[PDB]
Design an enzyme around this catalytic site. Structure first.
Site, PDB file in Angstrom:
ATOM      1  N   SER A   1       0.865  -1.190   0.000  1.00  0.00           N
ATOM      2  CA  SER A   1       0.000   0.000   0.000  1.00  0.00           C
ATOM      3  C   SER A   1       0.897   1.234   0.000  1.00  0.00           C
ATOM      4  O   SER A   1       1.724   1.365  -0.920  1.00  0.00           O
ATOM      5  CB  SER A   1      -0.978  -0.132   1.175  1.00  0.00           C
ATOM      6  OG  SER A   1      -1.616   1.088   1.479  1.00  0.00           O
TER       7      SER A   1
ATOM      8  N   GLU B   1      -8.831  -4.981  -4.687  1.00  0.00           N
ATOM      9  CA  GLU B   1      -8.229  -3.903  -3.909  1.00  0.00           C
ATOM     10  C   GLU B   1      -9.271  -2.919  -3.401  1.00  0.00           C
ATOM     11  O   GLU B   1      -9.045  -2.239  -2.391  1.00  0.00           O
ATOM     12  CB  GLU B   1      -7.186  -3.158  -4.746  1.00  0.00           C
ATOM     13  CG  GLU B   1      -6.038  -4.027  -5.290  1.00  0.00           C
ATOM     14  CD  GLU B   1      -4.945  -4.314  -4.254  1.00  0.00           C
ATOM     15  OE1 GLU B   1      -5.152  -4.077  -3.049  1.00  0.00           O
ATOM     16  OE2 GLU B   1      -3.866  -4.786  -4.648  1.00  0.00           O
TER      17      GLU B   1
ATOM     18  N   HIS C   1      -7.520  -5.676   0.037  1.00  0.00           N
ATOM     19  CA  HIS C   1      -6.360  -4.807   0.218  1.00  0.00           C
ATOM     20  C   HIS C   1      -5.679  -5.091   1.558  1.00  0.00           C
ATOM     21  O   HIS C   1      -6.260  -4.834   2.621  1.00  0.00           O
ATOM     22  CB  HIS C   1      -6.819  -3.345   0.127  1.00  0.00           C
ATOM     23  CG  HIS C   1      -5.711  -2.336   0.036  1.00  0.00           C
ATOM     24  ND1 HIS C   1      -4.806  -2.309  -1.007  1.00  0.00           N
ATOM     25  CD2 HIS C   1      -5.400  -1.281   0.830  1.00  0.00           C
ATOM     26  CE1 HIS C   1      -3.980  -1.288  -0.846  1.00  0.00           C
ATOM     27  NE2 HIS C   1      -4.325  -0.644   0.257  1.00  0.00           N
TER      28      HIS C   1
HETATM   29  C1  LIG Z   1     -12.882  10.557   4.381  1.00  0.00           C
HETATM   30  O1  LIG Z   1     -13.558   9.351   4.001  1.00  0.00           O
HETATM   31  C2  LIG Z   1     -13.673   8.480   5.053  1.00  0.00           C
HETATM   32  C3  LIG Z   1     -12.685   8.307   6.025  1.00  0.00           C
HETATM   33  C4  LIG Z   1     -12.882   7.391   7.065  1.00  0.00           C
HETATM   34  C5  LIG Z   1     -11.881   7.234   8.034  1.00  0.00           C
HETATM   35  N1  LIG Z   1     -11.518   5.823   8.266  1.00  0.00           N
HETATM   36  C6  LIG Z   1     -10.828   5.074   7.386  1.00  0.00           C
HETATM   37  O2  LIG Z   1     -10.396   5.450   6.295  1.00  0.00           O
HETATM   38  C7  LIG Z   1     -10.539   3.675   7.881  1.00  0.00           C
HETATM   39  C8  LIG Z   1      -9.580   3.901   9.037  1.00  0.00           C
HETATM   40  C9  LIG Z   1      -8.540   2.811   9.008  1.00  0.00           C
HETATM   41  C10 LIG Z   1      -9.311   1.541   9.262  1.00  0.00           C
HETATM   42  C11 LIG Z   1      -8.833   0.510   8.313  1.00  0.00           C
HETATM   43  C12 LIG Z   1      -7.324   0.535   8.316  1.00  0.00           C
HETATM   44  N2  LIG Z   1      -6.812  -0.829   8.190  1.00  0.00           N
HETATM   45  C13 LIG Z   1      -6.724  -1.529   7.052  1.00  0.00           C
HETATM   46  C14 LIG Z   1      -5.532  -1.491   6.308  1.00  0.00           C
HETATM   47  C15 LIG Z   1      -5.488  -2.258   5.132  1.00  0.00           C
HETATM   48  N3  LIG Z   1      -6.553  -3.011   4.794  1.00  0.00           N
HETATM   49  C16 LIG Z   1      -7.690  -3.075   5.504  1.00  0.00           C
HETATM   50  C17 LIG Z   1      -8.744  -3.890   5.082  1.00  0.00           C
HETATM   51  C18 LIG Z   1      -9.937  -3.950   5.808  1.00  0.00           C
HETATM   52 CL1  LIG Z   1     -11.283  -4.938   5.258  1.00  0.00          CL
HETATM   53  C19 LIG Z   1     -10.067  -3.208   6.978  1.00  0.00           C
HETATM   54  C20 LIG Z   1      -9.005  -2.421   7.391  1.00  0.00           C
HETATM   55  C21 LIG Z   1      -7.813  -2.331   6.664  1.00  0.00           C
HETATM   56  C22 LIG Z   1      -4.347  -2.328   4.295  1.00  0.00           C
HETATM   57  C23 LIG Z   1      -3.334  -1.208   4.556  1.00  0.00           C
HETATM   58  C24 LIG Z   1      -3.821  -0.032   3.971  1.00  0.00           C
HETATM   59  C25 LIG Z   1      -4.525   0.913   4.712  1.00  0.00           C
HETATM   60  C26 LIG Z   1      -4.989   2.043   4.030  1.00  0.00           C
HETATM   61  C27 LIG Z   1      -4.704   0.786   6.121  1.00  0.00           C
HETATM   62  C28 LIG Z   1      -4.450  -0.659   6.677  1.00  0.00           C
HETATM   63  C29 LIG Z   1      -3.142  -1.098   6.079  1.00  0.00           C
HETATM   64  C30 LIG Z   1     -14.070   6.659   7.134  1.00  0.00           C
HETATM   65  C31 LIG Z   1     -15.058   6.834   6.160  1.00  0.00           C
HETATM   66  C32 LIG Z   1     -14.849   7.745   5.125  1.00  0.00           C
HETATM   67  O3  LIG Z   1     -15.769   7.973   4.147  1.00  0.00           O
END
Ligand SMILES: COc1cc(CNC(=O)CCCCCCNc2c3c(nc4cc(Cl)ccc24)C[C@H]2C=C(C)C[C@@H]3C2)ccc1O
Ligand SMILES: COc1cc(CNC(=O)CCCCCCNc2c3c(nc4cc(Cl)ccc24)C[C@H]2C=C(C)C[C@@H]3C2)ccc1O
Lengths: 532, 532
Positions: free
Chosen positions: B197, B324, B437
């Site tokens: 990522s 992804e 992803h």
């Molecule tokens: C501004 O838009 C938004 C912003 C947000 C804020 N929250 C988020 O973006 C999510 C916060 C992080 C939670 C997931 C981070 N962990 C993950 C990660 C990855 N894959 C995931 C897959 C799943 Cl199914 C669940 C979590 C993953 C893969 C890697 C990549 C990322 C971006 C974070 C982390 C490590 C929520 C809703 C929205 O519409």
């Protein structure tokens, strides 16, 4: 008696012709207009003045002056479309086939030939009306109209060359049918106009034109619709092409009267020889002199008339062929040949889409290319050839017609849609051209019923089905016979959008004819070109 | 002795950790930078000052300050990504796993975590380096770097908050590895950097940046590349977002110095709490504080550097997962749910493409929609769901990576491309999300070898194959062992463009990964947006 008919313009003597195992009456070459010659060239037609004595209507008339194809001299596949009679500006005649014995007042079908508004003849073998009139017991008429600059040179504001006079030729023959067909055993209240290519567009234009709507009952459109991109021009573009035709012939260009006076002095072949030179682009499926959106035959733009419902509300039956594009690629695009499979290189593919969409900018051409290219296999000569075939047919025939179908059905009183995809067993054109532009006509006119033409028994049955669909629709507004036990051709509706295939197999109902490509051609690409 | 190592900055005492049936040495929480606290917030890192005594390296360090996901409290599928240690701005540490007994000079792999440049920790369970270090006998390093505003606030022209300081944190850990890894049995001439990522984008950015190139030998990129639309911003957009961070916190905005001074007075959580508010659009797969195209860490635009070959020429191994997009749709798009099949209505589909391509004009949104809509079946909630999934993954990960792959291969010394499409047997996320992803990482790090985790035997075999490809590539520049009898993963070439699937089945070779959609994303859509 049966062959001697008194019309409102004078007496006519027909002739008794054989058809299959029987006979029918034919009235060939009846005049419906004054000869549009001399100072009447480019003018609106005038009714034929009544004659004394008996008009000999035993013989096909002259054909209108037109470009003659010499690409394949002697080849039956192209010669079958060329004039088979002497060409003359004295060409405004119609032909009638009447069942024997004469009916009381039966359904009338009026055929309007196609040919891109630059060619066509009522007298072609493939338009011989005796089989349809005999088999379906209808009165079959074929009209004629001026083509090329003779029919469609347009200097808007001039009443000496106003434009659209070929469409007014068609209307005048329709007025004649309205006034006289009862004397031949036809019901003037039940007239169906039908035509292919420019004739299908013409049929739709009469649907649109207020001055035409009361002269027929319902309509059939084959491989053509009034909104096709090749079928009309603006007043400005018609005027540009008329001025450019004068420039090619060293005409005084100072004024409409001087330009027109110069063009009326030229021999007909002198205009024809330079006709193609006025096109604004290197192109295919584009024709020089076509109907003009003038404010009189057409009150407003075609799209605004379609959106507001300003058109005749009746029943329509219409459709397209599988490979509308191949003929135009054969004649005008690099890499195509009558004697080879015509595998198309990538370079020639790109040349082709530029010729097929001459009005597109570079972004537009990229959009077309992406929509029709398999980027897993972009050097496949067969896929490049067929993709160009689909581009030409989708852009010029299928998707304009589907736009018309959808807009009309919102206000109409019944729509029936077909997709003709039978390749004739005796086709003289090569396999790659598939189901060619114009090659449903022979089935509509019952030529498979003639043994010595070497169609299969299944093709005779298909032609008989098609003739019965056409005539039953003409009689009733419904191609289906009631209480019959064959599969029913369903109404096309806004929601379900059903159509049928026409081929030798049992009928299949489908929905949303080429909907994916026609979203591209009817919605996205026009938005893209308007935005760029 | 084995656990006591003298480095150029001071002595460190590691710890002996079990791994499967054996043991290896772990050096956890080694500082490589001065704590970036106080007046050093937003500044370039400074090398860690040498210390006396023995650094106790038996314990994971703190994690950097970051947004913490609370969407599914207690759910292992999301919490596995959250900081599992206390958060602190004092977070610039690295971890090392060393085979026992210590090798003389073996291959080094350095892990760079992803997380959108807004989150990530070196200490997550899924990044535990002992399985890969033990099984493949490599020295495995995981670094850390500042994320969010702390790592990527960019006020170009300021030397106090220049931008890209999280990328400089990574560089400084690489410099530490270059100077010190020989003391752990690692060969500083055979360092592979790999990340997923944002880590994978980071890896590509070190390939590009002249100040990074000489600190590693080759590179692995997983589901990210430096040219991704989410991975960088212009100096102007970086400045705008920094100023908007101040506005959200009632900062003096008159000069860089006062804005910066104001932001340095805030507690870390006050910045985090408003981080997402500075984005220009409602969007998914967009993050607030990311690398800036600054003219220093990156000499020119990434596209011009790619075109001219201005980057490190070596061997790369890279690839993507099948789905992804699903994680970003779950968290930010209407109609998606962890506890349902998430069939998407037409209305919600259109809402999703607007969120997925937030920078597109209405013409561009129409183009995306047409490219991904089956207009024979446009109300199919499953097709609408899978189409939006494809849009997100194609636009944000797959097609940027394919653009990188093709540009890089023109100049590089060997490319190996994969498509990971195995859905794990024990996945806690619903089936519609497919191959998610981040969920190839556990296979890369050998978690399936832990019987307690309940992977299948075929998943253990798949993890062992992948670890061997990654380490053999790190060792030699080629994932294959020549002279062996296993199926060979072929080089990606400009002409043939081959790649392999990674899953539990025998190896399949394919060509032109998602070429049709990526022509749309990499050539046509940008030309449409540049014209309009
Ligand atoms: C501004 O838009 C938004 C912003 C947000 C804020 N929250 C988020 O973006 C999510 C916060 C992080 C939670 C997931 C981070 N962990 C993950 C990660 C990855 N894959 C995931 C897959 C799943 Cl199914 C669940 C979590 C993953 C893969 C890697 C990549 C990322 C971006 C974070 C982390 C490590 C929520 C809703 C929205 O519409
Ligand atoms: C200046 O541009 C060009 C102009 C020309 C001139 N030639 C043409 O336009 C075509 C030749 C005149 C018409 C040929 C005979 N008409 C046909 C017709 C039809 N189908 C045909 C199918 C085949 Cl395979 C062959 C001929 C068909 C169906 C109907 C529709 C049209 C337009 C004419 C006519 C009736 C050739 C190449 C060019 O690049």
């Amino acid at each position: 008696s049966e062959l001697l008919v008194n019309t409102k313009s004078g007496k006519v003597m027909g002739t008794r012709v054989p058809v299959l195992s029987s006979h029918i009456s034919a009235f060939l070459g009846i005049p419906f207009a004054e000869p549009p010659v001399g100072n009447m060239r480019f003018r609106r037609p005038e009714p034929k003045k009544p004659w004394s004595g008996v008009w000999n209507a035993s013989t096909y008339p002259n054909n209108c002056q037109q470009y003659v194809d010499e690409q394949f001299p002697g080849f039956s596949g192209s010669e079958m479309w060329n004039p088979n009679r002497e060409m003359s500006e004295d060409c405004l005649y119609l032909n009638i086939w009447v069942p024997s014995p004469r009916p009381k007042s039966t359904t009338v079908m009026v055929w309007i030939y196609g040919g891109g508004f630059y060619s066509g003849s009522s007298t072609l073998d493939v338009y011989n009306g005796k089989y349809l009139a005999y088999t379906e017991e209808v009165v079959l008429v074929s009209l004629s109209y001026r083509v090329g600059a003779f029919g469609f040179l347009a200097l808007h504001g001039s009443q000496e060359a106003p434009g659209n006079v070929g469409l007014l030729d068609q209307r005048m023959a329709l007025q004649w049918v309205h006034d006289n067909i009862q004397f031949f055993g036809g019901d003037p209240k039940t007239v169906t106009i039908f035509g292919e290519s420019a004739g299908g567009a013409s049929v739709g234009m009469h649907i649109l034109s207020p001055g035409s709507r009361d002269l027929f009952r319902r309509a059939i459109l084959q491989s053509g619709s009034p909104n096709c991109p090749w079928a009309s021009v603006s007043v400005a573009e018609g005027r540009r092409r008329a001025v450019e035709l004068g420039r090619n012939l060293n005409c005084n260009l100072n004024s409409d009267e001087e330009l027109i006076h110069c063009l009326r002095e030229k021999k007909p072949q002198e205009l024809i020889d330079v006709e193609w030179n006025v096109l604004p682009f290197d192109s295919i499926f584009r024709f020089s002199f076509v109907p003009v959106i003038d404010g009189e035959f057409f009150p407003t733009s075609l799209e605004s008339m379609l959106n507001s419902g300003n058109f005749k509300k009746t029943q329509i039956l219409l459709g397209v062929n599988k490979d509308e594009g191949s003929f135009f690629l054969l004649y005008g695009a690099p890499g195509f040949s009558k004697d080879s499979e015509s595998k198309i290189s990538r370079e020639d593919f790109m040349s082709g889409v530029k010729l097929s969409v001459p009005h597109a900018n570079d972004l537009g051409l990229d959009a077309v290319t992406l929509q029709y290219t398999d980027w897993m296999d972009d050097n496949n000569g067969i896929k490049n050839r067929d993709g160009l075939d689909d581009i030409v047919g989708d852009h010029n025939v299928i998707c304009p017609l589907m736009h018309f179908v959808n807009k009309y059905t919102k206000f109409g009183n019944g729509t029936y849609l077909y997709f003709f995809n039978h390749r004739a067993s005796n086709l003289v054109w090569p396999e790659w051209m598939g189901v060619i532009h114009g090659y449903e006509i022979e089935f509509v006119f019952g030529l498979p019923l003639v043994k010595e033409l070497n169609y299969t028994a299944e093709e005779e049955a298909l032609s008989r089905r098609i003739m019965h669909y056409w005539a039953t629709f003409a009689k009733t507004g419904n191609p289906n016979e009631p209480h019959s036990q064959e599969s029913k051709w369903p109404l096309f509706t806004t929601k379900e959008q059903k159509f049928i295939d026409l081929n030798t197999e049992p009928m299949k109902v489908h929905q949303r004819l080429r909907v994916q490509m026609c979203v591209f051609w009817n919605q996205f690409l026009p938005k893209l070109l308007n935005a760029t």
